[PDB]
Write a protein that binds this ligand. Structure first.
Ligand SMILES: C/C=C(/C)C(=O)O[C@H]1C(C)=C2[C@H]([C@@H]1OC(=O)CCCCCCC)[C@@](C)(OC(C)=O)C[C@H](OC(=O)CCC)[C@@]1(O)[C@H]2OC(=O)[C@@]1(C)O
Ligand code: NA
Length: 999
């Protein structure tokens, strides 16, 4: 290793650290070393975010392909609105202003999101304090400077309440003990004890670096001196920041398809422009003299703008946002806080969920269920006294049972010592809450279950029914505390997996014989140090058959259908002398906890959630793999998976469950192979959550991942759906896409089902709005191919694509979900929205729509009483009316600009899209099977859309702008004559889809 700054500062001794930087602990760094170390390693801060300027942000709103076409069409419309002959400019610059206003309003929204968006990398800067206390050679006393000026090798001073400015190797602990709140890294807020002795492993995890102060953590209690190892992005919190900055998050499948849509849509538009130019090649055979090339050119640029406006679903991005935000409020009531709108689709395509066990799959409400001591040992004969405890709460309510029979715990000398261990070898307590009315825990959940246990046992038969409620919490515990005097506690450490307390009797003023040590820890580790076995009050040497009997029961309790976490309890009858014990060396604690005497074993249960059982079953029906990540041993982790439904009760899982150690010993090839079949990970290393995601993403799995600490932030950001707990850190939240407000696993599944039901409705109105843009383009191409006057103008099309079609599309987001949502495998991300026979249907609808609108306008020019007796051959040559009058003699040439034919065309387009919205209630189901009144919102929206159509037909300022006129009752019949059968057309195509394609 040859990167930068102090490498394995935790494995180096305090002398090797001071000699590395060449800095004295009493004086500190010289002002020359401050300049030198600041120039080499830089300042102690996370790098600033890229100040995306407002101008750069506005330009980003005009980088999409479709908004470029509208901008270009806005320019042509702006030019055409200038170079024109007339005096009516109240309806000239209207069209370009609307296109611009939509573009401006569109750019406004994009900025409104970026101003209100906050990345998780900037949330990490919440854990870096402003000031820091250092000792340098230019002064005597301690001086507080800005934390960004602290350099590696500095002699820093921290105390309780301070926030650790940098990664600090502890030199000297001035106070009695040092407790640090490393809650921002992991999830446990339990303060850990630090020391000054080196940790012999260079590649030890942060949990074992018991001589380090991590940048961002809080000093819980004490005061210490230390030397700065790393600063900036080299800290443990800074190494996480670099992993998050380097993580790239892809666009959602819908976003990738929309970007794909604009690509091909842009190609088709130009191709249509080519085709229109190819149809009117015959103008080359027309004489140069005669005709208006100035008027022939405006016509081609006029239909160009109309072609662009007819193609772009300008209302679609608003309906998606409306549908998403309304669905997000809906998920909020189901405890699913969705932080990113587009994630709702991604949540529906979820195929693999990786959830932590504790707090999510389980309730984190510990409770001691079973316990056993030694009944007697007579050579090879060996018997145990197994008991059972009732009450799943922390409340001291319940009794101890032996063979389903209530027993008095005070009648078993082994259970007396069992309770003494649990009450004294414990740093937690109880507290009866008067606001809530329940018994709450004070400390860890494991040690509190032991506190509840000694209250239920009551080995001394203390009068507890006479005491009050608040005094009932710590009744039997206090009785045991008055007996033995806790001298000191040997803290827990993962190396020996046990803790102990040194106790001396109360009445003992002039004595040195009588001390005891009470050890509590993991069964395998503690039993191996036991050379004796307590039986009631006596003691016998620990043999082989007896020791196997103990482990076998611990195996049955942890692997069986009980799924219990077992803790061995032992006592050191002859503890080492008080003076021969060094309390600063945590490496000699396992030494002090030797030559023990086995007492008994308690078995506690972390019960799974009452809804996890069936939620796992839905994922099986929905084709969603569930993976458990826990800290239980592999045997218990597998047993818990069998309990909640992940594993079958009797299926082979030798290749479907791995520990952190097992996973690392696998090569990268068998690692990626292990992730496609595993559903259980125990004792997971910190870097393994991201590795599991990458391997899952290599099989194109849409992966959800759970976390709550900054340690989980790189994995949350990398996963498609990062899922943070409402009780987690704010960094884990900002790094996640969804927050579980109740930390319940079942909320994940409920949000996936909701995410599926929203997209199925999203498919409809996406396919509905685009189907309208299809038929509109056909109408523009027909009126361009045939040489007809414009049937629809861009002003009208925008009203249709934003208002007239926007209300039904939004109502299509409220379509009732199917009954087999979670009975189908997850949707393929590559699955296109329109293809195959559905492609042909909208191909036929669009051809029909484009003909119906072009025909309705041409119908008024010809076969209408209100209209002229114009024929087909002159309607196509209408631009020659003003010049070649004898060829088209009859009426005014201004009649080819009448509003009546455009209104007929517009009213037809509106009526069809109202009918076509009903056809969008179901993809292939008929309206006879699924009636239109299935969606009341759709019917109401259609009523509103028509009422807004008559609005722009009568309210005098409006029909002048949109160039419309009120239709006669007869002309409205012709609208329905040509609009209504669009239902029969699509209904036939549905029948075909149901009887000759479903196989
Ligand atoms: C809106 C107007 C139409 C003309 C258009 O340009 O859309 C096309 C195109 C972009 C696709 C097509 C359209 O293609 C045509 O309709 C062929 C036009 C030829 C007519 C000339 C004959 C004289 C969609 C619209 O066709 C119809 C038939 O439904 C379907 C689908 O669209 C979707 O699934 C929507 C995805 C947001 C897309 O194939 C899509 O391209 C792919 O990327 C997808 C996946 O988008
Ligand atoms: Na993420």
């Amino acid at each position: 290793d040859n990167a930068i700054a102090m490498e394995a500062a935790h494995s180096k001794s305090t002398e090797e650290c001071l000699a590395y930087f060449g800095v004295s602990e009493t004086t500190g760094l010289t002002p020359d070393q401050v300049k030198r170390h600041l120039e080499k390693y830089g300042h102690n801060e996370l790098p600033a975010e890229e100040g995306k300027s407002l101008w750069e942000l506005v330009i980003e709103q005009f980088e999409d392909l479709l908004v470029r076409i509208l901008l270009l069409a806005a320019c042509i419309s702006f030019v055409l609105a200038w170079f024109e002959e007339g005096e009516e400019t109240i309806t000239a610059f209207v069209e370009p202003f609307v296109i611009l206003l939509i573009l401006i309003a569109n750019a406004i929204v994009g900025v409104w999101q970026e101003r209100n968006a906050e990345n998780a990398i900037e949330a990490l800067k919440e854990y870096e304090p402003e000031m820091g206390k250092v000792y340098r050679a230019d002064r005597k006393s301690v001086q507080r400077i800005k934390a960004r000026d602290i350099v590696p090798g500095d002699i820093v001073e921290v105390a309780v309440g301070d926030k650790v400015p940098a990664d600090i190797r502890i030199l000297s602990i001035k106070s009695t003990t040092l407790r640090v709140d490393q809650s921002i890294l992991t999830g446990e807020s339990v303060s850990v004890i630090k020391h000054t002795e080196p940790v012999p492993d260079p590649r030890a995890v942060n949990q074992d670096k018991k001589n380090m102060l991590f940048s961002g953590t809080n000093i819980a209690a004490g005061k210490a001196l230390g030397i700065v190892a790393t600063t900036g992005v080299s800290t443990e919190i800074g190494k996480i920041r670099d992993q998050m900055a380097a993580t790239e998050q892809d666009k959602t499948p819908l976003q990738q398809k929309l970007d794909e849509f604009g690509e091909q849509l842009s190609k088709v538009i130009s191709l249509i422009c080519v085709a229109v130019w190819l149809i009117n090649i015959g103008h080359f055979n027309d004489p140069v003299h005669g005709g208006s090339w100035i008027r022939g050119a405006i016509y081609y640029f006029k239909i160009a703008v109309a072609l662009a406006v007819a193609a772009i679903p300008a209302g679609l991005p608003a309906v998606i946002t409306t549908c998403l935000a309304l669905g997000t409020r809906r998920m909020a009531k189901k405890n699913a806080i969705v932080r990113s709108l587009p994630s709702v689709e991604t949540l529906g395509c979820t195929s693999v969920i990786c959830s932590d066990k504790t707090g999510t799959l389980t309730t984190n409400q510990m409770s001691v269920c079973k316990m056993f001591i030694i009944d007697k040992v007579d050579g090879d004969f060996c018997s145990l006294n197994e008991f059972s405890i009732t009450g799943s709460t922390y409340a001291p309510e319940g009794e101890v049972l032996k063979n389903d029979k209530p027993i008095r715990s005070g009648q078993f000398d082994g259970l007396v010592e069992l309770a003494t261990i649990c009450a004294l070898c414990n740093d937690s307590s109880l507290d009866f809450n008067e606001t809530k009315g329940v018994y709450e825990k004070v400390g860890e959940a494991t040690e509190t279950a032991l506190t509840t246990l000694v209250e239920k046992m009551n080995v001394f038969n203390t009068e507890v029914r006479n005491l009050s409620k608040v005094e009932r919490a710590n009744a039997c515990n206090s009785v045991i505390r008055q007996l033995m005097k806790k001298e000191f506690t040997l803290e827990f450490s993962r190396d020996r997996k046990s803790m102990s307390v040194y106790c001396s009797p109360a009445k003992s003023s002039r004595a040195a014989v009588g001390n005891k040590m009470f050890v509590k820890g993991a069964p395998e580790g503690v039993i191996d140090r036991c050379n004796y076995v307590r039986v009631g009050t006596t003691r016998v040497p620990m043999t082989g058959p007896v020791k196997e009997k103990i482990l076998s029961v611990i195996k049955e309790w942890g692997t069986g259908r009980d799924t219990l976490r077992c803790l061995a309890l032992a006592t050191r009858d002859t503890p080492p002398k008080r003076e021969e014990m060094v309390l600063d060396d945590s490496s000699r604690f396992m030494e002090y906890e030797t030559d023990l005497t086995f007492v008994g074993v308690v078995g506690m249960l972390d019960p799974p959630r009452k809804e996890v059982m069936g939620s796992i079953q839905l994922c099986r029906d929905a084709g969603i793999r569930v993976i458990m990540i826990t800290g239980d041993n592999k045997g218990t982790a597998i047993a818990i998976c069998r309990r909640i439904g992940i594993f079958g009760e009797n299926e082979e899982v030798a290749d479907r469950a791995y520990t952190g150690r097992e996973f690392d010993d696998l090569p990268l090839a068998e690692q990626r192979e292990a992730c496609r079949r595993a559903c259980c990970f125990a004792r997971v290393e910190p870097s393994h959550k991201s590795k599991i995601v990458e391997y899952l993403q290599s099989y194109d799995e849409i992966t959800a991942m759970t976390g709550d600490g900054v340690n989980d932030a790189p994995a949350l950001k990398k996963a498609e759906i990062g899922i943070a707990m409402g009780s987690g850190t704010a960094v884990a939240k900002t790094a996640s896409e969804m927050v579980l407000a109740d930390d319940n696993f079942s909320t994940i599944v409920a949000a996936v089902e909701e995410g599926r039901a929203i997209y199925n409705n999203m498919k409809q109105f996406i396919r509905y709005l685009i189907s309208s843009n299809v038929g509109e383009v056909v109408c523009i191409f027909l009126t361009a191919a045939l040489g007809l006057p414009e049937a629809l103008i861009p002003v009208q099309l925008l009203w249709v694509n934003l208002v007239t079609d926007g209300l039904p599309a939004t109502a299509l987001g409220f379509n009732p979900p199917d009954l087999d949502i979670m009975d189908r495998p997850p949707r393929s991300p590559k699955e296109p929205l329109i293809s195959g026979w559905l492609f042909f249907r909208y191909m036929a609808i669009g051809g029909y729509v484009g003909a119906a609108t072009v025909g309705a306008a041409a119908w008024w020019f010809m076969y209408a009483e209100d209209g002229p007796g114009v024929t087909y051959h002159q309607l196509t040559h209408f631009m020659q009316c003003t010049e070649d009058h004898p060829h088209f003699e009859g009426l005014d040439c201004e009649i080819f600009e009448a509003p009546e034919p455009m209104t007929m065309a517009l009213s037809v387009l509106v009526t069809i899209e109202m009918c076509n919205a009903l056809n969008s209630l179901s993809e292939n189901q008929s309206l006879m099977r699924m009636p239109p009144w299935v969606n009341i919102w759709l019917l109401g929206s259609i009523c509103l859309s028509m009422s807004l159509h008559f609005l722009i037909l009568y309210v005098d300022p409006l029909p002048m702008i949109f160039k419309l006129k009120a239709l006669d009752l007869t002309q409205w019949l012709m609208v329905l004559k040509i609009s209504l059968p669009v239902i029969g057309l699509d209904e036939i195509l549905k029948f075909i889809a149901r009887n000759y394609l479903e196989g």
